[PDB]
Structure 1
C-alpha cells in the first residue's frame, strides 16, 4: 500500500489548529484543501507527543485504510495528510458538524414528531420518521459500499456514525476495533467477524436510531447470561419511536443464522422502499 504524496500531502502551515473533539482528534481550518472554498473546517487526527513505534504504525495504518477504501458520500472521507518531516503525522478528514449520531439523537428527544403537519414552522428543526429512516438508509448504503470494498467494519454502532450538514450521515472507525452489545452471537462465541456479523450490528444501530439514542439492552448486565439468552433467541423489545416495519427489520438483522440475515444491498432496497412508503 504505497503513499501518493502528490495526491494527499497537505502543508502543515495551511492549517489553523483548533479545539479538541470527542484519539487526539481536533477541529482545524484548512486553507486551500478545497477548490470551491478558500477556508474549510476539517477534523485532524494527530499522532500523540511521545508516541511509540507501534502507536505511530497504527495511525499510519489508519491513514492507509482511508486512502485504500475510496470515496463514498456515507463514509468519512480523507481530505489530506501531513507525513513529511518537520511536524507530527496528521490525518485530515471531512468535518461532521453535529458529531456522533447517538449523542445527537438524544439531544432531540423533545423535538420529535412522526411527521410535520402544516403550519410546519411549529416543528422547526424537529426530527421525524423520515429523518430516522433516511439515516438508516444512508448507513446501509455506506455499509454496502464498505462491503463492496471487502471491508468489515467490526464495531458498527451509532457512536461511529457522524452527522454532517443537510442530514448527511457518515460511517467512521471501520476496520479499527460495552462492545458486546453490538456483537453477533457468532462473534461473541466463535470470534467470527464477517459482513453478516456487521448486519447484526446494523440491527442494533437501527434500535439506537429508533430509540433516539438509547443504550442497547437497558437494565441488563452484559455477562454470561446475556450471551446465553442471546444465543437462545431473545431479542430487544421494540424501541419507543419505531414503526412495525423497522422493528421487523431489526429482528431480521438479528437472525441467529448469519446466512439468513438480509444483505446490505437488500437493506438499501428495503429501506429505500420504506422511505418512499413513509
Structure 2
C-alpha cells in the first residue's frame, strides 16, 4: 500500500483513536464512528466522538485519490458551523483515516421522516424554518468559497445531537477527465430530481443550479421527507420542467415559504435568488414566526 505524506497541521496519532460502530458504507468507502482523544489541543485529554472516513477492502488506486482529494478540499474551504468540518487525519503508520465531525441524528431526510405527526418528540413550524435557515447559511459560506455542491439534498444534510444542520459531501471529486465515460461500478445514479433544468441538459453545475437544488430541499423539509415529482418517469422530467411544471405547495406550508421554493425554481438561472438573499428571506420569516 501507499501512505500519504503527513500534514503536521492536521495529523493525529492513530494511537489516540478508538474505532467503534460503523455508520455506513458506500462507493467511496465506509464511515466508522470512533472516539478521538486529544483532537482539541486546548484540552489534550478530552475524548471527542468523531466520524472516520476510510477505504474498504475493495479499494483501488482511484478510491484512494478521491478520498485524498476530498480531504484536501475540506482544508482549503475552511470551517463553518453549518457544514461537516474536517477535524484531523491519520496518514502514517497505517491506512488513511479522515476524521470529520460526527452527527448523532443521521441525515435530514431520515430525521424528518422519523418525526412525522401521528419516542422522538415532534417538530414545529418554526423548527422546520430554522432547519432551512441553517442549511441556507451553510450554502452561503460554501458559495463564498467558490464551492459548488452539485448534490444538495436532504440526504446530504446531517443533524447533530444539538439539532444543528451540517452540509456533507461538499468536497467530493467529480468526473473531471473522462466525464462521458463510465465503468460498471455499483449504484447511486444521478440526482436528476434535484438538478436544475440547465444542469440536466448540459451537465454543468453552478451556484445557480445549487439554488434550484435548495428549492427541492426546501420542499423535502415541509413534506417531512417526501419524494420529489412522484410518479413522473425519469425520461420525461426535463421536458416537463422545461414546459413550466413545478411541484405543488406542500400541505401546511405558508405562502412565503412556497414563494421561496418557486423563486429557487425560476427557469432562468440569473433570475434565481442568491444564497445570501435566501438567508435574509428565511431570517425574516423566522422572526415573525413564533410558537
- TM-score over 0.5 for the pair: yes
The answer to whether 1:255 aligns with 2:266 is yes
Aligned counterpart for 2:57 among listed residues 39, 49, 57 = 49
Aligned counterpart for 1:218 among listed residues 230, 236, 239 = 230
Q: Per residue, is there more helix in 1 or in 2?
A: 1
Match of 2:253 in 1: 242
Aligned counterpart for 1:73 among listed residues 73, 81, 84 = 81
Cα distance in 2 between the residues matched to 1:76 and 1:181: 24
SS class of match (2:129): helix
Deviations 1:155-214 (A, max 9, x none): 000000000122210001114265100000000012221000000000000000010011
Deviations 1:108-160 (A, max 9, x none): 0027xxxxxxxxxxx99320111111111111111110000011000000000
Match of 2:145 in 1: 149
The answer to whether 1:89 aligns with 2:96 is yes
SS class of match (1:233): coil
Cα distance in 2 between the residues matched to 1:137 and 1:276: 12
Aligned counterpart for 2:22 among listed residues 12, 20, 23 = 20
Quickly say closer, same or farther: Cα 1:89–1:129, change in 2 above 3 A.
Answer: same
Cα distance in 1 between the residues matched to 2:85 and 2:166: 9
- Would you say the 8 A contact 1:154–1:175 is kept in 2? no
The ranges of structure 1 where at least 4 consecutive aligned residues each deviate by more than 4 angstroms after the TM superposition are none
Cα distance in 1 between the residues matched to 2:73 and 2:89: 13
Range that drifts further, 42-51 or 257-266:
42-51
SS class of match (2:104): coil
- Would you say the 8 A contact 2:6–2:91 is kept in 1? no
Match of 1:120 in 2: none
Q: How does 1:107-118 map to 2 (within 5 A)?
A: 107-110=114-117
Cα distance in 1 between the residues matched to 2:230 and 2:74: 34
Match of 2:111 in 1: 104
Range that drifts further, 199-208 or 21-30:
21-30
Cα distance in 2 between the residues matched to 1:215 and 1:32: 42
Deviations 1:235-256 (A, max 9, x none): 0111124211111110000000
Range that drifts further, 238-247 or 260-269:
238-247
Match of 1:114 in 2: none
TM-score (norm 2): 0.87
Deviations 1:75-131 (A, max 9, x none): 1000000011x21101000101101000110000027xxxxxxxxxxx993201111
Unaligned 5+ segments in structure 1 are: 112-122
Aligned counterpart for 1:130 among listed residues 121, 126, 130 = 126
RMSD (CA atoms):
1.8
